[PDB]
């Protein structure tokens, strides 16, 4: 099991995703990629679950 963490810089840190469709794609060199895709409504407790 590997862990992945994404840190936001100033360019992208000025936006808070609300009612949008965030999507990530991890593409290795050989093999199928991994496309995460979610829809985030609102945050809570400074740490959400999706």
């Amino acid at each position: 099991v590997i862990g992945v963490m994404i840190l936001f810089g100033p360019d992208l840190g000025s936006h808070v995703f609300q009612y949008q469709t965030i999507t990530i794609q991890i593409t290795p060199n050989i093999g199928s990629p991994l496309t995460i895709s979610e829809y985030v409504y609102q945050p809570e407790g400074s740490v959400s679950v999706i």
Partner: protein
């Protein structure tokens, strides 16, 4: 002059042993919320369970 068209309603409070009236004016129907009991998280209008 705009207060000649709003819907005025009053309410009185007996603060510091002297009656102090008030006058609240509204120019359009609207509704709001406010916490009454058991609301730890304040800042995002998220009503906790049992609040």
């Amino acid at each position: 002059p705009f207060l000649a068209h709003d819907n005025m309603f009053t309410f009185t409070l007996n603060i510091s042993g002297t009656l102090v009236t008030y006058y609240a004016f509204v120019n359009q129907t609207f509704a709001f919320t406010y916490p009454v009991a058991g609301d730890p998280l304040i800042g995002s209008a998220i009503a906790p369970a049992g609040s």
